[PDB]
Amino acid sequence: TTQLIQQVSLTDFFRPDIEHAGSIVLILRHPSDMIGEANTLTQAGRDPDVLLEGLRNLFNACTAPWTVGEGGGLRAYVTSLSFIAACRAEEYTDKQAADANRTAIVSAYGCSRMETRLIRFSECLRAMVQCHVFPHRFISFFGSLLEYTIQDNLCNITAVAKGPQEAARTDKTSTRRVTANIPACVFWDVDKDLHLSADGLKHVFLVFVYTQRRQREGVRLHLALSQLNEQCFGRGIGFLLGRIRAENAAWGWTGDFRGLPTQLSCMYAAYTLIGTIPSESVRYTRRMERFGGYNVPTIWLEGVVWGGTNTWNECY
Amino acid sequence: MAMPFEIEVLLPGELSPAETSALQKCEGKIITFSTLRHRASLVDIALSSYYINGAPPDTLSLLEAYRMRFAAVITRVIPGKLLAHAIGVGTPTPGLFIQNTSPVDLCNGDYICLLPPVFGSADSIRLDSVGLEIVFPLTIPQTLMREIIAKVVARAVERTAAADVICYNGRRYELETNLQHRDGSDAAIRTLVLNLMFSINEGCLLLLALIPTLLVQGAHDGYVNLLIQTANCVRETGQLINIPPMPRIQDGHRRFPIYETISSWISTSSRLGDTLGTRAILRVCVFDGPSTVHPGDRTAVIQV
Amino acid sequence: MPFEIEVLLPGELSPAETSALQKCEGKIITFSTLRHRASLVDIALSSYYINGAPPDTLSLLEAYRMRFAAVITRVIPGKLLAHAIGVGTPTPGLFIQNTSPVDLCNGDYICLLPPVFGSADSIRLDSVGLEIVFPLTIPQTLMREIIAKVVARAVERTAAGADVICYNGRRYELETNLQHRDGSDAAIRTLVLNLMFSINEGCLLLLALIPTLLVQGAHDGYVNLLIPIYETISSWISTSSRLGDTLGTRAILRVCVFDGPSTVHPGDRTAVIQV
Amino acid sequence: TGFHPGIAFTVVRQDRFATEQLLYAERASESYFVGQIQVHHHDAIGGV
């Protein structure tokens, strides 16, 4: 049939009592790797200690600060996609929905010091894209939330990692099944931009966007839905992001190969294939929905078959 | 979705028994589709769909069509309809099989790539009652297709600025490519040069002063002698170019240049050929059949 | 339904050897062809032998892409069973005994890499006169880095006239103690050579086409340009492409634990599904 | 600028009107054979 996955993590960056089933969950690597990675990947004339400060000041005020070092057996593993969306709600073009998302998730979680945690995470992402350690290399697609069990400051998630979505029987309130849903601020579809607007199969991509201009970093991600394959999808987005590519490549006998555009200086986006919709034509509904006490708009997909082989395709 | 993505291509009721027998003689050949529906039409696998600007295309344009589309395999044809299984979208696909349409063999285990028909005349089936040509993409192993793509992109660059034989397993097959216009050419050359640029980096200077070490090794060892003389550049520079003492690298105690100049080349190299050409979607895995496969025998495969 | 492979271990096995083959529960082997009856002289190292002597690292990276891998399930004192991964949907609990310097988190995609470290996988079946090397099961994320660092070290070593790799909060050093680094330097030279030759041929071909690349300003013109020579371009692509597809190594497996331990220290066994 | 450049054209344009046809037939003009109704399953949004 399908395939489930399980993970126990803390509940600092994610609370399944607040996410609804069908929300995408993301997994993180250990933050300790960033130290050595930035130690060997930072650009000459730039000090990665700003990344160190970002990480250190982030993890100083998120949860129990201890244990996050090497001896970590329990960790902050999973984060919600809506979380990583609402901490960067200042770059999504459809402002009003993203702003509703942000205020809702600031009010729905613990209530205390999340404004703190949010800007901590925003500053951390800014710093990493500034020291040429990209977020796409550390954040992967875990699954779609199916069922959970929580305790004091610790959770136990089980999510769908492969196969059709609605073939997963869960003990919910309304009906034994559940469908996928994403916040309406990250939903960007490549097809209508390029105007091919055809029915049939559509892939679902998870695409990041990088704008590295000095002291003006920028990181945001969307969930693409296009007809293109994984080969020419890079061409398509590279096309309708011309200004970012330009301002990134321009401002990112002795040979003297100094100050030339390198691959990390010219990078602007990276994407992955995560599923597909083998239906007759895709229907989706943007209905306003409640996260506990607040109302935020979402996208309700139908018939998504999660895929795999989590390999990132880069675009410089 | 638990079965392979079946496809129901329809034949008009006005097709001659001769053409239906011809179709019977092509079960197991590969076709493509513009979009991926479930009730397709015969028009969408004919040459009337491979038209750029209202004309039959060239070897470069078709080479872009073959990856701008989706692929399928003709399992069996019937008077009612035509059946085909999608390849690289819905994972489950058991016992699939292909027909080898190529002037070379098919070794067990190699990966399969598909080309536009270049070698000689194509095995084109002309359906006259509807007026549709049907040409089937080739079936070429991956290690060989690269030589063809290189030798065709060279001809493209040459035609734009200002050999057609390839040896494989001791056999000479002539290349009859054509480019009746000019925009696909530079559309390819721009990618060529773009990916050519992002290879050079800081550590290339250190990699350059290592040319004379490569020369003295070319004198010292034997396979280095096979490697050095096909390189139409290194054999000249290390004998006619010099690089003085490299200056110290800015913040030389933290970063490391060679790591970058060699890591940003693994990425840019794998994706190279899959941009000037196509990727490999299928790999011949004969379980209990013959050892190799002659031109025109039915194979057994699993998708990449 | 699942594909099944039998390997009939012969007699004359020293019980001190079978005692170690009993430890080979969950290691990966490869065949050149998929059958049901497999002879022990097919997974032995003596099968590769691409050019006489034992294969290189380039030779092994080229093998791992053409052969069909199969994981060794339970072994009994008589014979050895194995299930082919890649096709067949193995219904049993297809576990993997990770053999890698670094850990394995929950939910990684695992690829293969020849023993480019302190090789100790070899089980030395002397009584029969053949030996079997297993591959390293590394995560897909460390795949682009390990190759790059191990080749950069050698390309600096030939440039005679803290290099640690980190993952999941653990650090594994690459600087082997002995500065008498023969042997492994020899089983890696045709890679550093074949790679180096490609990059130099690319650089000295780029600069030989456009006469306004660096002479119109390495910052002003080079970037503004960004926004039989004709049998050499061919010679460059026709080799750079074969190298790239060799170092691709698409994943084959994925570690998905379900109510167990969330980390796989080297030498433990865990459940794995196929991709 | 309104100067006549010594040439003339014949503009052409085509128009598509929606009309209501009126159809007539004779008695027993065609034989309409009908075959056998067959079924086949196929996977979907999760069911059949």
Side-chain angles (χ1 to χ4, degrees), chain B residues 108-111 142-143 146-147 149-151 153-155 157-158 161-163 192-200 204 206-208 210-211 213-214 217 221 223-224 227-228 230-234 237 256 258-259 261-263 265-274 276 280 283-288 302 304, chain C residues 3 32-36 58 62 64-68 85-87 144-145 147-149 151-152 155-156 158-162 189-190 193-207 209-210 213 222 225-226 228-245 247-248 250:
Chain B
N108 184 20
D110 50 22
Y111 295 7
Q142 188 175 10
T143 68
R146 295 305 171 277
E147 268 89 359
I149 300 184
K151 293 214 189 306
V153 76
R155 297 291 295 275
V157 162
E158 167 92 352
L192 167 57
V193 173
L194 273 177
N195 298 64
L196 207 66
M197 288 140 69
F198 286 70
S199 89
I200 322 182
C204 167
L206 168 56
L207 283 153
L208 275 156
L210 291 158
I211 292 166
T213 46
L214 300 199
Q217 288 168 308
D221 303 307
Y223 172 62
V224 298
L227 269 179
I228 180 65
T230 77
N232 283 347
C233 79
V234 175
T237 74
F256 301 99
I258 309 299
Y259 177 99
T261 196
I262 212 165
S263 42
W265 182 81
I266 303 313
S267 199
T268 313
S269 309
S270 89
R271 56 195 269 170
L272 166 69
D274 316 330
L276 284 201
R283 65 197 191 104
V284 165
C285 168
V286 286
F287 282 77
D288 303 69
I302 172 63
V304 169
Chain C
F3 197 74
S32 306
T33 320
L34 283 192
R35 310 189 175 105
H36 288 80
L58 177 64
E62 204 90 0
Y64 283 8
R65 196 172 178 268
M66 202 94 83
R67 279 152 150 255
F68 308 89
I85 48 183
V87 283
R144 192 173 309 282
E145 290 183 17
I147 280 182
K149 279 198 167 190
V151 61
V155 83
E156 201 160 318
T158 177
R189 179 163 37 82
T190 185
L193 198 81
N194 280 271
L195 197 148
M196 185 146 52
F197 266 115
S198 56
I199 285 178
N200 310 340
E201 192 148 332
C203 178
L204 312 162
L205 192 85
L206 170 140
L207 295 159
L209 261 58
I210 321 184
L213 279 153
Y222 193 94
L225 200 63
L226 195 141
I229 181 176
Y230 315 99
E231 286 312 292
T232 303
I233 296 175
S234 314
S235 297
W236 181 77
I237 283 182
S238 46
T239 72
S240 177
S241 85
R242 314 192 48 173
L243 266 303
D245 269 307
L247 314 175
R250 54 213 61 74

Side-chain angles (χ1 to χ4, degrees), chain A residues 39 42 46 227 257-258 263, chain B residues 35 202 254 264 268 274:
Chain A
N39 246 346
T42 323
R46 185 173 295 112
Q227 221 183 20
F257 285 141
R258 199 69 30 89
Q263 284 193 206
Chain B
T35 174
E202 201 46 68
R254 182 221 64 205
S264 65
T268 313
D274 316 330

Side-chain angles (χ1 to χ4, degrees), chain A residues 11-31:
Chain A
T11 199
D12 72 9
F13 299 152
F14 176 93
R15 296 176 64 186
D17 53 30
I18 278 299
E19 296 302 320
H20 290 150
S23 159
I24 301 130
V25 281
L26 297 186
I27 192 84
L28 298 200
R29 264 164 64 161
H30 207 288

Side-chain angles (χ1 to χ4, degrees), chain B:
Chain B
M1 212 65 188
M3 305 163 41
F5 198 99
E6 306 270 323
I7 297 198
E8 327 179 4
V9 166
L10 288 186
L11 312 153
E14 311 314 284
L15 276 294
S16 176
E19 314 215 311
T20 66
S21 183
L23 277 187
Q24 297 282 129
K25 296 303 171 190
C26 83
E27 299 148 88
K29 289 170 138 185
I30 286 173
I31 64 177
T32 48
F33 294 92
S34 157
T35 174
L36 200 54
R37 292 190 213 81
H38 179 57
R39 281 270 305 279
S41 171
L42 179 54
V43 184
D44 262 8
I45 68 151
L47 190 64
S48 89
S49 159
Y50 289 104
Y51 279 163
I52 51 157
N53 317 136
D58 269 331
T59 61
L60 268 185
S61 40
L62 288 153
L63 187 59
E64 296 292 326
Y66 282 155
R67 58 185 208 249
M68 211 79 46
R69 290 196 180 193
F70 296 78
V73 165
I74 299 176
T75 73
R76 183 167 183 266
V77 311
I78 46 186
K81 60 183 73 175
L82 167 54
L83 269 157
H85 291 38
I87 290 184
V89 303
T91 39
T93 300
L96 192 46
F97 77 117
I98 316 153
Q99 181 152 7
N100 168 34
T101 57
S102 175
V104 302
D105 315 286
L106 278 192
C107 179
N108 184 20
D110 50 22
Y111 295 7
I112 296 299
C113 276
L114 73 165
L115 270 173
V118 184
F119 308 79
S121 278
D123 52 312
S124 64
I125 298 181
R126 193 161 62 252
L127 277 55
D128 218 0
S129 160
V130 66
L132 293 180
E133 326 192 331
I134 303 197
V135 305
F136 306 109
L138 289 168
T139 52
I140 296 284
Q142 188 175 10
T143 68
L144 156 66
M145 166 189 256
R146 295 305 171 277
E147 268 89 359
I148 309 304
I149 300 184
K151 293 214 189 306
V152 73
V153 76
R155 297 291 295 275
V157 162
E158 167 92 352
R159 185 181 295 273
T160 297
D164 37 357
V165 157
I166 175 59
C167 320
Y168 172 76
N169 192 84
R171 285 295 173 82
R172 283 196 190 85
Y173 308 141
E174 300 158 19
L175 266 190
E176 299 78 8
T177 188
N178 76 323
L179 304 90
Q180 68 194 356
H181 55 67
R182 63 183 67 87
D183 219 345
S185 64
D186 66 356
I189 299 178
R190 56 177 293 253
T191 81
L192 167 57
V193 173
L194 273 177
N195 298 64
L196 207 66
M197 288 140 69
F198 286 70
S199 89
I200 322 182
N201 283 268
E202 201 46 68
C204 167
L205 282 80
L206 168 56
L207 283 153
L208 275 156
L210 291 158
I211 292 166
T213 46
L214 300 199
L215 268 287
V216 78
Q217 288 168 308
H220 185 125
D221 303 307
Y223 172 62
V224 298
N225 189 325
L226 159 68
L227 269 179
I228 180 65
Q229 292 302 145
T230 77
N232 283 347
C233 79
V234 175
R235 57 191 282 282
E236 312 273 321
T237 74
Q239 318 213 45
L240 274 302
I241 310 292
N242 186 306
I243 299 295
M246 41 173 189
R248 47 205 283 150
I249 181 55
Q250 308 291 109
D251 194 348
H253 84 81
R254 182 221 64 205
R255 67 169 296 242
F256 301 99
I258 309 299
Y259 177 99
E260 302 156 289
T261 196
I262 212 165
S263 42
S264 65
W265 182 81
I266 303 313
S267 199
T268 313
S269 309
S270 89
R271 56 195 269 170
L272 166 69
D274 316 330
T275 289
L276 284 201
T278 55
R279 69 184 189 279
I281 50 177
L282 304 148
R283 65 197 191 104
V284 165
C285 168
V286 286
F287 282 77
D288 303 69
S291 277
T292 53
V293 166
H294 292 211
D297 309 336
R298 308 206 201 194
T299 43
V301 79
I302 172 63
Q303 67 203 38
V304 169

